[PDB]
Amino acid sequence: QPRPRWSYTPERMKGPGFSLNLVKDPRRKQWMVNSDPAKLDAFYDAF
RNA sequence: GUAAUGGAUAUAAAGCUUAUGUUUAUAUAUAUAUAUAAGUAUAUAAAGAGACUACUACCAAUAGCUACACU
Ligand SMILES: [Mg+2]
């Protein structure tokens, strides 16, 4: 049984695990993305 | 209001696709022999010359003109 491609990232495409580029504001590094399939279906049944 | 030709704020990454250099021996055996030694040319001439076209010359064919001085 494989995994849905939208759920995970290919393990072999990741690298060191830390970010090599500098950021001016650490607050801009945060953003909440949706991962609930049920919540995604609540939008299609509307639109 | 002013600034950006490598702007700005985020995002991803890792044994080398750098506009840069120097070097380049066969055979045999467990030193001897041979004599420059990585290999390569589906790349590279113009002292002069050929062909085609054009220009400048020379030349006077073709064409036009001249007969009571030709027939
Ligand atoms: Mg004539």
Curated annotation (Swiss-Prot):
Known partners and oligomeric status: Component of the mitochondrial large ribosomal subunit (mt-LSU). Mature N.crassa 74S mitochondrial ribosomes consist of a small (37S) and a large (54S) subunit. The 37S small subunit contains a 16S ribosomal RNA (16S mt-rRNA) and 32 different proteins. The 54S large subunit contains a 23S rRNA (23S mt-rRNA) and 42 different proteins. mL57 forms a heterodimer with mL44 and stabilizes rRNA expansion segments 1/2 at a membrane-facing protuberance close to the point of attachment of the ribosome to the translocon in the membrane.
- Tell me where on the tree of life, at the top rank, the source sits: Eukaryota
Task: Recite the lineage of the species.
Answer: Eukaryota, Fungi, Dikarya, Ascomycota, Pezizomycotina
For this chain, the family text in UniProt reads: Belongs to the ribonuclease III family. Mitochondrion-specific ribosomal protein mL57 subfamily.
Protein role = Component of the mitochondrial ribosome (mitoribosome), a dedicated translation machinery responsible for the synthesis of mitochondrial genome-encoded proteins, including at least some of the essential transmembrane subunits of the mitochondrial respiratory chain. The mitoribosomes are attached to the mitochondrial inner membrane and translation products are cotranslationally integrated into the membrane.
What is the protein's name according to its record?
A: Large ribosomal subunit protein mL57
Q: Where are the transmembrane segments?
A: none
Q: Where in the cell is it found?
A: Mitochondrion
Source organism per UniProt: Neurospora crassa (strain ATCC 24698 / 74-OR23-1A / CBS 708.71 / DSM 1257 / FGSC 987)
